[PDB]
Amino acid sequence: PRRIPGTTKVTYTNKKGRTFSFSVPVSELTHPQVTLESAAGTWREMDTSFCELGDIEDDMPSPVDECLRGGSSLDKRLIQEVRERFVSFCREYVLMDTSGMKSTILSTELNAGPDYEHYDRRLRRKRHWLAIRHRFEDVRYVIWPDVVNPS
Amino acid sequence: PDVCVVQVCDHMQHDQGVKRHALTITYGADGFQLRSLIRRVRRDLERQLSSTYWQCYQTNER
Amino acid sequence: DTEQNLLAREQHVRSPAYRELHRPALTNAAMGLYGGEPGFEKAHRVWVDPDRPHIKHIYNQTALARNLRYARYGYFKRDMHLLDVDKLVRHARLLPT
Amino acid sequence: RRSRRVEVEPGDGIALGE
Amino acid sequence: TEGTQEKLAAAIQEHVQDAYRFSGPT
Amino acid sequence: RRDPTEFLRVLRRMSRTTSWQKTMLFASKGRMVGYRLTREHYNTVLFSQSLWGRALEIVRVVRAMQEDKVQPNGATYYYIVNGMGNADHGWNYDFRINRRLEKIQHWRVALEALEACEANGFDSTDTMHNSALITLVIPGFNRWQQASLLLQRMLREDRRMHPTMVKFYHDCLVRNNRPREASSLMRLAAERGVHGYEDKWEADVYKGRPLDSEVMNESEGQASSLAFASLMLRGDQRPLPENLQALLEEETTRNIEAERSVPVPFSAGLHATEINSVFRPRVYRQLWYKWQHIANRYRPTAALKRRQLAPRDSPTGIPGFYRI
RNA sequence: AAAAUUUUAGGAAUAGUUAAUAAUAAUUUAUAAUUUUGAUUAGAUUGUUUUGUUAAUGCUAUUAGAUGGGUGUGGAAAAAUAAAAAAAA
Ligand SMILES: [Mg+2]
């Protein structure tokens, strides 16, 4: 914690021309001026890219999505992390408990997805398979690079 | 500024016949360090206040 | 020549305004409680497209939700600047000459 | 009431003399 | 194809009036 | 479009009177007809979702608030972190309540709001940090490493622990086989004066033992005491020779995994903490918002009996009380 | 295991969902299932030619019971308390 100095010196010139220092007691602010409705644009926002919702226009957020967001892919343990996350993703897709999940064509879900109550029973496995496909198109050259020491 | 008016107002209701306090400290101008003031209030009340739960935090610049 | 009109219809269907306008009816868990609150004790207004319906059996013959009388010409005279006249000729009742 | 500083202040500017 | 946005605005405004029915009087 | 003050006046009432679905319908469809939603519009919507504990709806409001370039204040972060703690969880008989809560990272949004509260300059409250620790700990979630580091910096900021947070965090550590972290939690809550824990104080049997993390990097790098530093002795015990003790140490680690692999036949694959642990917030049983109840479990059905509030063949004003 | 018969002064949607199945323990298929001949939820709620009344195929009353996480024991959970149901001379 840094303490406020309290006093400041400002330069004042008289009518003759002599300059000296007014000592002004000043204190700094501590709280942001957020009560005004004007938006400056300089505030740290909250990340919500990892959340899974019922947005059918998006993909299901996998952990591999945070591993391909602009890192150094030539690092070896990052390749191992990508590999084990894709293995866990495919294994949790294969060993998924499909007891209550049913996929019948319902007419009322035409201009939307399945409803919010039937997300886990209708939308979950299809979004999981589409996420597996869309990650396989991004990862298959990292785990299995083309033949020209390996990672 | 050269003058400063402060207000210490707590609203005392009756929660099952027992008093509960909702206390607000309000300054008159900006610059006065409330973040350093609250930790002085917070250190004093950790030994002297017997209740279930209590908070102390800064809501505005004043 | 038909590929342009078919692709335009297929892109009009997948537009977000068409999918927002033709949303299904809101459930009772989506509206709120079991009832008593005005405005949230029923569902909202459901709009259907007669060529690509998102519900089966567009019309009904119930006592209170009876809607065959509201499909006739005159209720679509409110919006003739936005109207589609081929859908008006195919799906309307009591049209004049 | 704010105590007077031991240095000069802008509040003493009218006492500076024009 | 072009007049679906104003129809959507009229539908959402009707839904907002049906939600305004919660307030009751005035 | 009527008056925008009338639009805010109905939004002020529905967050105050009725449930969470009314403010989500009004603010979303009101945004599509052109009502400019300011911060006081989003704070009333986020008050209603934080009360009912809608963890999916808080993410959808905070996505729309950042799209409209509305800067949140400290009252907004007070509703985001406290609203993730009020989320429904737990298990009915073999039926998981709110199984879609796990794929949302609602513990991470409650942690993201705490980082964005301190970075923007606001002062986070003591009930935010207790509600942020709850979201890592609740029986659908096993995150005790992150909850210990959150509790470690909570004591350095001179916060006081909530009695609901200690009840959840003690049950998470005994579920994840941590008796040292659970005995140090009951020892901590008794010394700080947490209500309900002033009688539960346990002796520290791990006083001479080092931490489990510093054992592991020491084993990678006195050589007789290097391999058996993790082995716990009573004082009246001595180790074997190192060729005999290492054959005995792998005897125990194959017997522990043999006893942990056999399933209990009537548990549905659940720990005994998670059996009969259905959670809904305090709004579900005849109660409204209070600040000191962060993640308040709904009161039992034995609190309000029927036929003592209204006579026979007469309606009672409790529509959803006895329904769990 | 089946048929069968409930009520709401201001009447609308419902779903761990229907059928098939080389499928105990459903990674599949389907134009699936309930409901305006009144469903689901919410309110009230053991039912019962046993009660009362009347000239009355009308109106009006009810107290036999049961109980998916307390223990996989036991043939059967009905088990934390009952003046008999006399419980191995
Ligand atoms: Mg088949």
PDB file of N, CA and C (backbone and C1' of nucleotides) in Angstrom, chain F residues 93 95 99 266 276 306-307 312-316 318-319, chain G residues 16 41-46 61-63 68-70 72:
ATOM      1  N   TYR F  93     -33.032 -39.336  -5.111  1.00  0.00           N
ATOM      2  CA  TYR F  93     -32.765 -40.753  -4.813  1.00  0.00           C
ATOM      3  C   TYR F  93     -31.719 -41.441  -5.685  1.00  0.00           C
ATOM      4  N   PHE F  95     -31.547 -39.453  -8.860  1.00  0.00           N
ATOM      5  CA  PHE F  95     -31.780 -38.439  -9.877  1.00  0.00           C
ATOM      6  C   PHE F  95     -30.978 -37.196  -9.524  1.00  0.00           C
ATOM      7  N   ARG F  99     -28.224 -31.219 -13.496  1.00  0.00           N
ATOM      8  CA  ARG F  99     -27.027 -31.845 -14.041  1.00  0.00           C
ATOM      9  C   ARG F  99     -26.343 -30.989 -15.094  1.00  0.00           C
ATOM     10  N   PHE F 266     -25.877 -50.048  -2.823  1.00  0.00           N
ATOM     11  CA  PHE F 266     -27.110 -49.268  -2.768  1.00  0.00           C
ATOM     12  C   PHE F 266     -26.801 -47.790  -2.594  1.00  0.00           C
ATOM     13  N   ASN F 276     -29.237 -37.781  -0.477  1.00  0.00           N
ATOM     14  CA  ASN F 276     -30.286 -36.942   0.123  1.00  0.00           C
ATOM     15  C   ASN F 276     -29.771 -35.530   0.402  1.00  0.00           C
ATOM     16  N   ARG F 306     -49.897 -28.238   7.152  1.00  0.00           N
ATOM     17  CA  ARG F 306     -51.250 -27.910   6.744  1.00  0.00           C
ATOM     18  C   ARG F 306     -52.210 -28.236   7.887  1.00  0.00           C
ATOM     19  N   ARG F 307     -53.417 -27.671   7.798  1.00  0.00           N
ATOM     20  CA  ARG F 307     -54.509 -27.724   8.776  1.00  0.00           C
ATOM     21  C   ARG F 307     -54.181 -27.025  10.090  1.00  0.00           C
ATOM     22  N   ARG F 312     -60.144 -27.428   7.406  1.00  0.00           N
ATOM     23  CA  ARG F 312     -60.412 -28.481   6.435  1.00  0.00           C
ATOM     24  C   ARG F 312     -61.321 -27.968   5.325  1.00  0.00           C
ATOM     25  N   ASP F 313     -61.068 -28.455   4.102  1.00  0.00           N
ATOM     26  CA  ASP F 313     -61.739 -28.031   2.865  1.00  0.00           C
ATOM     27  C   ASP F 313     -61.612 -26.529   2.626  1.00  0.00           C
ATOM     28  N   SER F 314     -60.472 -25.956   3.006  1.00  0.00           N
ATOM     29  CA  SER F 314     -60.194 -24.541   2.843  1.00  0.00           C
ATOM     30  C   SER F 314     -58.795 -24.359   2.273  1.00  0.00           C
ATOM     31  N   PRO F 315     -58.618 -23.453   1.312  1.00  0.00           N
ATOM     32  CA  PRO F 315     -57.320 -23.330   0.647  1.00  0.00           C
ATOM     33  C   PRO F 315     -56.302 -22.615   1.518  1.00  0.00           C
ATOM     34  N   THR F 316     -55.049 -23.018   1.366  1.00  0.00           N
ATOM     35  CA  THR F 316     -53.932 -22.408   2.064  1.00  0.00           C
ATOM     36  C   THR F 316     -53.065 -21.661   1.061  1.00  0.00           C
ATOM     37  N   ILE F 318     -50.023 -21.555   0.307  1.00  0.00           N
ATOM     38  CA  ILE F 318     -48.708 -22.146   0.081  1.00  0.00           C
ATOM     39  C   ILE F 318     -48.784 -23.063  -1.137  1.00  0.00           C
ATOM     40  N   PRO F 319     -48.648 -22.528  -2.353  1.00  0.00           N
ATOM     41  CA  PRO F 319     -48.811 -23.388  -3.537  1.00  0.00           C
ATOM     42  C   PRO F 319     -47.650 -24.338  -3.763  1.00  0.00           C
TER      43      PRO F 319
ATOM     44  P     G G  16     -41.216 -36.588 -17.119  1.00  0.00           P
ATOM     45  O5'   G G  16     -40.025 -37.415 -17.769  1.00  0.00           O
ATOM     46  C5'   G G  16     -39.231 -38.281 -16.972  1.00  0.00           C
ATOM     47  C4'   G G  16     -38.242 -39.056 -17.802  1.00  0.00           C
ATOM     48  C3'   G G  16     -37.557 -40.204 -17.072  1.00  0.00           C
ATOM     49  O3'   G G  16     -37.226 -41.230 -18.009  1.00  0.00           O
ATOM     50  C1'   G G  16     -35.942 -38.614 -17.722  1.00  0.00           C
ATOM     51  P     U G  41     -49.546 -33.804 -12.412  1.00  0.00           P
ATOM     52  O5'   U G  41     -49.347 -32.261 -12.065  1.00  0.00           O
ATOM     53  C5'   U G  41     -48.050 -31.689 -11.975  1.00  0.00           C
ATOM     54  C4'   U G  41     -48.096 -30.180 -11.998  1.00  0.00           C
ATOM     55  C3'   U G  41     -48.711 -29.496 -10.791  1.00  0.00           C
ATOM     56  O3'   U G  41     -47.837 -29.433  -9.683  1.00  0.00           O
ATOM     57  C1'   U G  41     -49.535 -28.496 -12.768  1.00  0.00           C
ATOM     58  P     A G  42     -48.402 -29.653  -8.197  1.00  0.00           P
ATOM     59  O5'   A G  42     -49.315 -28.377  -7.939  1.00  0.00           O
ATOM     60  C5'   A G  42     -48.735 -27.091  -7.787  1.00  0.00           C
ATOM     61  C4'   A G  42     -49.790 -26.029  -7.619  1.00  0.00           C
ATOM     62  C3'   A G  42     -50.878 -26.335  -6.604  1.00  0.00           C
ATOM     63  O3'   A G  42     -50.487 -26.089  -5.266  1.00  0.00           O
ATOM     64  C1'   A G  42     -51.882 -25.611  -8.596  1.00  0.00           C
ATOM     65  P     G G  43     -50.965 -27.086  -4.103  1.00  0.00           P
ATOM     66  O5'   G G  43     -52.473 -26.660  -3.829  1.00  0.00           O
ATOM     67  C5'   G G  43     -52.807 -25.327  -3.475  1.00  0.00           C
ATOM     68  C4'   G G  43     -54.300 -25.140  -3.414  1.00  0.00           C
ATOM     69  C3'   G G  43     -55.057 -26.188  -2.618  1.00  0.00           C
ATOM     70  O3'   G G  43     -55.025 -25.938  -1.226  1.00  0.00           O
ATOM     71  C1'   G G  43     -56.157 -25.799  -4.678  1.00  0.00           C
ATOM     72  P     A G  44     -54.777 -27.144  -0.199  1.00  0.00           P
ATOM     73  O5'   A G  44     -56.197 -27.854  -0.104  1.00  0.00           O
ATOM     74  C5'   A G  44     -57.369 -27.109   0.186  1.00  0.00           C
ATOM     75  C4'   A G  44     -58.600 -27.921  -0.103  1.00  0.00           C
ATOM     76  C3'   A G  44     -58.547 -29.346   0.408  1.00  0.00           C
ATOM     77  O3'   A G  44     -58.903 -29.421   1.772  1.00  0.00           O
ATOM     78  C1'   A G  44     -59.311 -29.330  -1.833  1.00  0.00           C
ATOM     79  P     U G  45     -58.379 -30.636   2.667  1.00  0.00           P
ATOM     80  O5'   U G  45     -59.393 -31.807   2.319  1.00  0.00           O
ATOM     81  C5'   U G  45     -59.029 -33.151   2.543  1.00  0.00           C
ATOM     82  C4'   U G  45     -59.284 -34.003   1.330  1.00  0.00           C
ATOM     83  C3'   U G  45     -58.522 -35.314   1.288  1.00  0.00           C
ATOM     84  O3'   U G  45     -59.111 -36.312   2.096  1.00  0.00           O
ATOM     85  C1'   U G  45     -58.364 -34.244  -0.813  1.00  0.00           C
ATOM     86  P     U G  46     -58.564 -36.564   3.585  1.00  0.00           P
ATOM     87  O5'   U G  46     -58.678 -38.137   3.746  1.00  0.00           O
ATOM     88  C5'   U G  46     -59.544 -38.863   2.894  1.00  0.00           C
ATOM     89  C4'   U G  46     -58.776 -39.771   1.973  1.00  0.00           C
ATOM     90  C3'   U G  46     -59.641 -40.734   1.175  1.00  0.00           C
ATOM     91  O3'   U G  46     -60.104 -40.172  -0.037  1.00  0.00           O
ATOM     92  C1'   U G  46     -57.959 -41.950   2.298  1.00  0.00           C
ATOM     93  P     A G  61     -71.984 -32.821   3.182  1.00  0.00           P
ATOM     94  O5'   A G  61     -71.919 -33.687   4.517  1.00  0.00           O
ATOM     95  C5'   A G  61     -70.699 -34.270   4.939  1.00  0.00           C
ATOM     96  C4'   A G  61     -70.930 -35.419   5.886  1.00  0.00           C
ATOM     97  C3'   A G  61     -69.841 -36.478   5.905  1.00  0.00           C
ATOM     98  O3'   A G  61     -68.755 -36.116   6.737  1.00  0.00           O
ATOM     99  C1'   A G  61     -71.974 -37.513   5.791  1.00  0.00           C
ATOM    100  P     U G  62     -67.253 -36.160   6.177  1.00  0.00           P
ATOM    101  O5'   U G  62     -66.723 -37.592   6.627  1.00  0.00           O
ATOM    102  C5'   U G  62     -66.838 -38.016   7.977  1.00  0.00           C
ATOM    103  C4'   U G  62     -66.906 -39.517   8.079  1.00  0.00           C
ATOM    104  C3'   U G  62     -65.814 -40.281   7.351  1.00  0.00           C
ATOM    105  O3'   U G  62     -64.589 -40.325   8.063  1.00  0.00           O
ATOM    106  C1'   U G  62     -67.912 -41.267   6.886  1.00  0.00           C
ATOM    107  P     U G  63     -63.252 -39.739   7.393  1.00  0.00           P
ATOM    108  O5'   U G  63     -62.249 -40.978   7.363  1.00  0.00           O
ATOM    109  C5'   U G  63     -62.715 -42.305   7.565  1.00  0.00           C
ATOM    110  C4'   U G  63     -62.042 -42.944   8.750  1.00  0.00           C
ATOM    111  C3'   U G  63     -62.766 -44.125   9.377  1.00  0.00           C
ATOM    112  O3'   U G  63     -62.572 -45.342   8.678  1.00  0.00           O
ATOM    113  C1'   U G  63     -62.028 -42.638  11.076  1.00  0.00           C
ATOM    114  P     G G  68     -42.894 -45.682   0.080  1.00  0.00           P
ATOM    115  O5'   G G  68     -41.767 -44.561   0.039  1.00  0.00           O
ATOM    116  C5'   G G  68     -41.111 -44.248  -1.178  1.00  0.00           C
ATOM    117  C4'   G G  68     -40.120 -45.316  -1.555  1.00  0.00           C
ATOM    118  C3'   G G  68     -38.658 -44.989  -1.299  1.00  0.00           C
ATOM    119  O3'   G G  68     -38.283 -45.254   0.041  1.00  0.00           O
ATOM    120  C1'   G G  68     -38.928 -45.945  -3.462  1.00  0.00           C
ATOM    121  P     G G  69     -38.008 -44.054   1.073  1.00  0.00           P
ATOM    122  O5'   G G  69     -36.429 -44.084   1.271  1.00  0.00           O
ATOM    123  C5'   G G  69     -35.764 -45.315   1.508  1.00  0.00           C
ATOM    124  C4'   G G  69     -34.302 -45.118   1.816  1.00  0.00           C
ATOM    125  C3'   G G  69     -33.969 -44.140   2.929  1.00  0.00           C
ATOM    126  O3'   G G  69     -34.147 -44.708   4.215  1.00  0.00           O
ATOM    127  C1'   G G  69     -32.495 -43.830   1.087  1.00  0.00           C
ATOM    128  P     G G  70     -33.969 -43.819   5.542  1.00  0.00           P
ATOM    129  O5'   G G  70     -32.463 -44.100   5.981  1.00  0.00           O
ATOM    130  C5'   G G  70     -32.072 -44.032   7.348  1.00  0.00           C
ATOM    131  C4'   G G  70     -31.520 -45.348   7.838  1.00  0.00           C
ATOM    132  C3'   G G  70     -31.968 -46.571   7.047  1.00  0.00           C
ATOM    133  O3'   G G  70     -30.959 -47.578   7.124  1.00  0.00           O
ATOM    134  C1'   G G  70     -32.775 -46.733   9.259  1.00  0.00           C
ATOM    135  P     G G  72     -27.984 -53.709   6.345  1.00  0.00           P
ATOM    136  O5'   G G  72     -27.959 -54.989   5.410  1.00  0.00           O
ATOM    137  C5'   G G  72     -28.092 -54.862   4.003  1.00  0.00           C
ATOM    138  C4'   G G  72     -28.777 -56.063   3.413  1.00  0.00           C
ATOM    139  C3'   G G  72     -28.070 -56.684   2.215  1.00  0.00           C
ATOM    140  O3'   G G  72     -28.271 -58.095   2.236  1.00  0.00           O
ATOM    141  C1'   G G  72     -30.225 -55.946   1.573  1.00  0.00           C
TER     142        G G  72
END
